[model samples]
Target: QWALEDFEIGRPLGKGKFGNVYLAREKQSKFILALKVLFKAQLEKAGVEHQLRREVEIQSHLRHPNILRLYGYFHDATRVYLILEYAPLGTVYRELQKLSKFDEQRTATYITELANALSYCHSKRVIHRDIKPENLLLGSAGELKIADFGWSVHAPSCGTLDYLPPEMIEGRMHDEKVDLWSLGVLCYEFLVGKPPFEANTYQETYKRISRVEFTFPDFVTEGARDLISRLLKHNPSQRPMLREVLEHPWITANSSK
Candidate 1:
């Protein structure tokens, strides 16, 4: 059995509502890892124990380079401890916050990684309802790693407004296709510096997203423009699936560049 005593805790890495993440190393092997300490009382009081359980279930089952690994979990009287893969480079979103936008090659590469990861996810009936930059971490080699499953579901809700798809805004039935729409928004943000339909207010943002009414900035390449248009279609049926996205001319062209 895994014990907290098996690892030596280090400095705090990050924090969230109920607890904080700490850097740790296994005493026996000296293997570095990230430990998430979740306050069980806070989680239960908030009526989100099920959410945490689901998050653990989904993340522990998923295995892919683009997805952050959930090694295991244990609990004490007041907290639940989760062991996660360490991403040395930290969040891609933070880097993008500093860089504003990425060039075509880099943007395409990350998107391709995300697409491949999500494709694998969908195949297993796992839908990552949230796919924004904040959820994407980076390895030392600059590879993308999806780091959070707090909002993840077997099929899905309650993602950030900017990443919400048309079906979500309209309260219509949705499936894996919702992720495709969010990917469109993420790709656009990657290339153009902001989400395509961002607005000053939540109401206006919802209106823009519902209508799929956003113009691509001229700086975005023609190929990227084409892909974004198809991906952000108001009707989920019109959005290209991941397979199609991988095969699209723009992705095909830039993936090798």
Candidate 2:
């Protein structure tokens, strides 16, 4: 089993409520990785030890190009440590902010990659409830990686808030379609530079999400609009599946280039 002394920690990659993620290398193997250190007390105080275990359980078993890799984990008295794959290019959110928005080709490429990954998740009965730019990271080769699984769950127990599907907001029992709705929101944010249902407050956002009240800006492409139209439907069952999304003309046309 690996311990703190087995790895050489480098600069900090990021931080969260529990602790920090640092760039690190295993001394013997020289394995480049991200070391996520979480505080035990904070985890217990938040009553999310179950969540941590679940996240680890789900992510460790998942294998896909676009899914962030979770190698393994260990714990000490005060903290738990997770070893994860490093994405040198950083997050998609930062890239989106820098460019103000991605072009059609870039947006379609990312959506295609994630759709493929999410499709894989769905096949295994796992649903990634949260699918936002901040949760996505870009790799050195420019591939998109789904990084955060804190909100993931096996199907029939979907979860989310901002990018939530209407069924979830209305307290209706839901499934993988919730992820489809989030994918639509992600696509919109990529092409339009903001979520379709942005409001001044969380309550208002909830209202908009439940009602599926959103419109395409004039600048959004016709093909992009069509794809989002199929995804952001108020009825979860009405949304297109990820397999179909991959075969969509927009994805095929742009991704082939």
Candidate 3:
């Protein structure tokens, strides 16, 4: 039950290919939110009309501290607007760019938060196919939030090239374990400043990922290396569960505040 008039739009927060996001405030409640405006024409041109509908349906129902909240949505003749929780600190990708790489404590904390959120999603039969840094945002408290659900599906779902698991690249059916693989990539990127399977070309990256070919830098801790290996398993069933990820020695040691 929202309308365009219900919000007073502020400055543009970010811009995407389809549309832009803006800072907005609810008129009566004075609640601040990020308004994602997507052009209907652009979505149709991209053949993602159903994708956006599914994204809205799935994200709106999910309630977890580490997952961005979709308060509601509204549409006009030309555009659709999603009212989402304002993540003041912006994207994890931007933060990573500035820092080059994260320290063990911050990386472990983020991994723990994501594992908890993904566990909740699995409990609800939702599989978040994309878990890259670009899809993650940080709130005012600097906590990680799973911000985008464009690639999420209800139990059933390229995700990003660098984060794709072997099964996905091989064109096989996948499950929640896909998120676990992305988690491993995220961990490697956070520690090493880039993805584990990164290569000069798409084919090279695909080959490396399919082969589960990656080597740890000398700087990564043994516990972290162990955790990453567990998650980056070639077989989907061999990947560690989200709960196990949260309980890993690396997370348990470094995530302690």
Candidate 4:
């Protein structure tokens, strides 16, 4: 079995509730990679194996510079190691916490990168069901990479609670447009450092999401509010697809960079 001695690390990267991220090196070629080490029994006992496999498959076939790269996987009897793209700049959530928030132009660039990458994914029928700042990263050169796909549902599939359109959360049919809802939420979070309609609990969050009642932050630009409102419309059919989103005035006015 591949043991702890099999790998070497430069430094401790970070830690999670059940696992740890280590900045490690491949003994084969010494290439730098982010290694997510998790206990097999803990995760499998929790019944997340299927979800983990889907994430692996999704990352393996996913292609976009603005999405994190999944090199491959290795396993021992008791553990699983996911070799992933290393983003040394860490998460954008932490950065926003430091800077308080992003400006309109910066937020627009972030949205553009995410939308361009996500629209590519959706064109292939891959819906990134979750899109949050904490799961976002900035590479050394300032490229944006959507980081975690842990909650991602590979579609053409159903929408999610936080980013779900009203018709979808009620069990009606939906499609890749779910991602547009997430993009709208992401835009709000980028500008304000908080979600538009977060409630006290998951159930309440779902209810608000179902209602699609976005409380626009007062400081946000009108164009920003207008675009976010349209993208996160109550009806899935009413939400703008990426094509329509690209041509929207909000994007057009602020996206000239």
Candidate 5:
């Protein structure tokens, strides 16, 4: 029942491959929202209407403090608009770029929040195939929020190369364990300033990832190293579950109350 006229558009929030997001306010309730606008023609040309529909359904179904909420959607002749929670602080990727990296306490806090969110997704039989800084956002309080579901599915893979698990690299069927690998890469990037398996080229990066070859910097604590190692296991089955990640020594030691 929502329509364009029901909300007053504000400033531009961010831009995506399909379109831009804007800050908007509901006329009646005065509720703040992010209005994501995607062009129907672009979607049709890209042949990703199915992906967009699935993204909408999965994101709208999820409810967690660390996950962004999808309020609703509507369409005009040229574009489809999605009503979403507005995270005022913007993307985690921007913050990471500004700071270069995070301290252990901050990194652990984000990882803990992500673990809880991903655990919720898993319980719902949804797997977030893409878990990267660019896809995460910061709320007004600077809390982490998983913001994009474009690559999510009931169960799937098709994530950023830097975060892809060995199983995915080998073209094997993957489950939620792929998320565990991405989490490991995220933790490393948070502490070390770059992804663990990052290299000069795609082929080299793939080789490093497939070999599970990465080293922690001297500044990385042993507890953090242990957790990353556990999550980055070459064998997907060997990766620790999200619950265990919450209980890991680093998370327990550094996560804020």
Candidate 6:
């Protein structure tokens, strides 16, 4: 039900699996807006339409600089449009693709920012089930914005495929620690250019994650390797809290500087 006036074509935005996003300049200002047009029927067909409403409601309450802002929305009988804050660098995947991999300083910066954002979310009792780099957007001034809360929720056991902690995957109720686990994975991927569990099949990858004995590359410095090792504990009991994580050597060394 979107009208032609919704957007112009020159400023291309990235494509979602089922839809496309574009940067649409608002009528009254020089500022740009992000518009995502998705098929409501398609989401309902996938049985996640109801969940999207919850995600949007939660997004409406957030006001963090590191988290993308959801400005407003409109819907027709068949489709819905979300007006959002522009992320100039698009997806973090695009940024990763350009570099061979991220350095320790860069990785630490992103981790500190994510920890701060996650702490804010957890304080409100919201758990972000998905926290991969793909869910992040690199903004102008090199800031990182956490986006795409479609897979996110406030309850325990709401988890993601690649980054679920052992507790959540084993049917135990879990919380924001799941995001920390994903952050550990992101750190590993940032260093190696690939996630720790590299198997093609889901079952096999989960098995590897359960084992929890992966090694850091020889090239990674001892400080980073130590931090990742402590975070990758399979027991989850052995993992550090976000407050502790925020104080780790890497985070402390990189946060303010």
Question: Given candidate 5, what's the lDDT at residue 111?
Answer: 95
For every model shown, the clashing-pair count is 0, 0, 0, 0, 0, 0
lDDT of 4 by residue, 1-257 (tens): 33456567777677764477889887767778888887888887778888888888888778888999988887778878888889988888888999888888788888888989888887777877778776788889877899777767756552225555565567766678877888888888889887876777767877888767678767988899888888878766788878777777877777745
Better of 5 and 6 by TM-score: 5
- Which 10 consecutive residues of model 2 have the lowest summed lDDT? 157-166
State the weakest 10-residue window (summed lDDT) of model 5. Answer: 151-160
Of 3 and 6, the candidate ahead on lDDT is 3
lDDT of each: 0.88, 0.90, 0.92, 0.78, 0.91, 0.79
Comparing 5 and 6 on lDDT, the stronger one? 5
lDDT of 6 at 238: 78
Off by over 4 Å in 6: 1-10, 157-160
lDDT (tens digit, per residue) of candidate 6 on 68-130: 999888887777888889888777777788896888788888888888888888888888878
lDDT of 5 by residue, 1-257 (tens): 98899999999988867899999999999999999999998899889999999999999988899999999999998999999999989988999999999999999999999999999999998998788998899999999999889878877544347988888888899999999999999999999899999988889988999898998889998898899999989888899988899998889989987
Candidate 1 wrongly placed segments (more than 4 Å): 156-159
List ranges where model 3 is wrong by over 4 Å.
157-160
TM-score for each candidate, following the candidate numbering: 0.94, 0.96, 0.96, 0.89, 0.96, 0.91
Q: Which tens-of-lDDT digit does each residue in 107-205 have in candidate 3?
A: 999999899899999999999988899889999999999988997887645434899999988989899899999999999999999999998889999
Instruction: Please say which candidate is ahead in TM-score: 1 or 2.
Output: 2
Worst 10 residues of 4 by lDDT: 156-165
Better of 2 and 6 by lDDT: 2
